[PDB]
Ligand binder design. Structure first.
Ligand SMILES: Nc1ncnc2c1ncn2[C@@H]1O[C@H](COP(=O)(O)O)[C@@H](O)[C@H]1O
Ligand code: PRO
Ligand SMILES: [Zn+2]
Length: 488
């Protein structure tokens, strides 16, 4: 459903998008991220260059989320990129530095900072008055993935954020986990306009050395594969016992700290691209669009007139004062049709066509990117209407994407109707016993004919009769309903 709106002659050219999003997804995703000047392929597999058009989106995610964790008294720090083998162990996806002259003991590039920070958490934490401790850092992470890499979704090097907190009680640590999860869900929905499902991971899908793991799950209806959006781990007293992170509570006894760890990576950018894009190229939500309004004065070869420069400057002046990020494309090198497709490929929310008739009426022609809505707005109303249009743009993207996610979830009660649903490129919600043994047989049978538990949704829309309702696989007392499907 990415081919409904009108295409121009420039959109059907090579400077547009050639592949269809549904029938040829991988080629579509490559053309969208490359022709929009977001990604540049690197001579090292799995690594990609974040060009200014895409790095702007990551900077906005930084500004919003960093300001949210500071509301909860989370402080930023920085830990070394290297780690020793003895510390890293109390494996195949860890890059090892062995030479500089070889090294007697090779050092490793951090896949995560648990083994780096917690040896010093045990040093910094001695009393209950020293808790809670909340540390975060914005850094890059290297993980040599064995599967075929995908830009943003699965890269060997990616930018991320990792928060690590320590608490005096499990209760305080758990409500810290829910806070970061709701902020993670707020990033995808309130900022990226991408719908995600808040839930709890299964025992077989949770963080390895953790206690409880909660996450948000994203899904791509076109490819029919799920994508894990972000994770928030309740580590409990597991890691504190390994590194000796114990505090002295009131009453004098010794107790191991209750820790949490949570991360969000540049995978969020890719899930957004695949959620909103169409056959013209990028479709960006206005809250992360590098340019929300592009002003295209009708001019070819000849220089821009003094009246066109006067109109385009005051329109830019009104939008700049109104908080809208706007640029003027007065390049006489390309035709107006060329500029339309150019800024549509890179997902500019609105374009302003400024012709001689628009200067006479003191209005501008506005064309909306996602739905090709056309309208005349007087200049006297730009300060008010254009912020509203960008608000309507953001709301429309989230609404249309959310009704595609609900459309991609099918309720199943018996394993006989499970396979037919998955090939429809849809997820499965089913009653499940949440046992590790049951999940191991589900992934084996689904692969022979593989789907895994995506998350146990926090919001249970379907009721389970106590004692009677049985698992959708084999036979056991089902606890509640769990979301399944194949991943990316
Ligand atoms: N190669 C990768 N590129 C981008 N993000 C990743 C990559 N590998 C893992 N992540 C994300 O990093 C977090 C780590 O969680 P996990 O996948 O359980 O290790 C999750 O939010 C993943 O989606
Ligand atoms: O690797 C992970 O998934 C967790 C979350 C960030 C820190 N460690
Ligand atoms: Zn079962």
């Amino acid at each position: 459903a990415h081919h409904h709106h009108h295409h121009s002659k420039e959109n059907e050219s090579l400077l547009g998008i050639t592949a269809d999003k549904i029938t040829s997804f991988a080629d579509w995703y490559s053309q969208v991220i490359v022709k929009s000047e977001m990604i540049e392929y690197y001579d090292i597999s799995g690594c990609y260059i974040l060009r200014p058009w895409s790095y702007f989106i990551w900077e906005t995610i930084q500004s919003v989320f960093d300001q949210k964790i500071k509301q909860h008294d989370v402080q930023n720090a920085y830990f070394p990129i290297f780690v020793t083998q003895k510390k890293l162990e109390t494996s195949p996806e860890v890059a090892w530095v062995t030479k500089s002259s070889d090294l007697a003991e090779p050092i490793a590039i951090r896949p995560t900072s648990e083994t780096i920070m917690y040896p010093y958490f045990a040093k910094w934490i001695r009393s209950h008055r020293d808790l809670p401790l909340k540390i975060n850092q914005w850094t890059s992470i290297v993980r040599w993935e064995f599967k075929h890499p995908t830009p943003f979704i699965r890269t060997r090097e990616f930018l991320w954020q990792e928060g690590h907190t320590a608490h005096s009680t499990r209760k305080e640590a758990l409500e810290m986990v829910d806070i970061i999860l709701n902020e993670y869900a707020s990033i995808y929905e309130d900022l990226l306009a991408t719908p995600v499902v808040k839930g709890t991971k299964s025992e077989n899908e949770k963080f390895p050395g953790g206690d409880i793991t909660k996450s948000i799950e994203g899904f791509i209806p076109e490819i029919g594969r799920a994508v894990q959006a972000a994770t928030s781990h309740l580590l409990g007293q597991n890691f504190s016992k390994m590194f000796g992170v114990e505090f002295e509570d009131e009453k004098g006894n010794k107790e191991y700290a209750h820790q949490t760890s949570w991360g969000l990576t540049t995978r969020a950018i890719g899930v957004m691209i695949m959620t909103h894009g169409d056959n013209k190229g990028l479709v960006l939500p206005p809250k992360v669009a590098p340019v929300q309004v592009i002003i295209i004065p009708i001019i070819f070869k000849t220089v821009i007139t003094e009246e066109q420069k006067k109109i385009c400057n005051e329109v830019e002046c009104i939008l700049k004062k109104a908080g809208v990020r706007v640029k003027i494309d007065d390049r006489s090198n390309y035709t107006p049709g060329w500029k339309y497709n150019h800024w549509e490929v890179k997902g500019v929310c609105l374009r302003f066509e400024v012709g001689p008739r628009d200067i006479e009426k003191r209005s501008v022609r506005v064309v909306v990117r996602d739905n090709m809505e056309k309208m005349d707005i007087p200049i006297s109303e730009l300060e008010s209407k254009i912020p509203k249009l960008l608000e309507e743009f953001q709301n429309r993207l989230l609404f249309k994407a959310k009704q595609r996610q609900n459309e991609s979830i099918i309720r199943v009660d018996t394993f006989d109707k499970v396979m037919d649903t998955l090939n429809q490129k849809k997820m499965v919600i089913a009653p499940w016993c949440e046992d590790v043994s049951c999940e191991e047989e589900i992934k084996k049978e689904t692969a022979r004919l593989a789907m895994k538990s995506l998350c146990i949704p926090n919001d249970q829309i379907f009721k389970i009769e106590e004692g009677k309702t049985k698992c959708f696989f084999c036979d056991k007392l089902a606890k509640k309903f769990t979301l399944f499907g194949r991943s990316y």
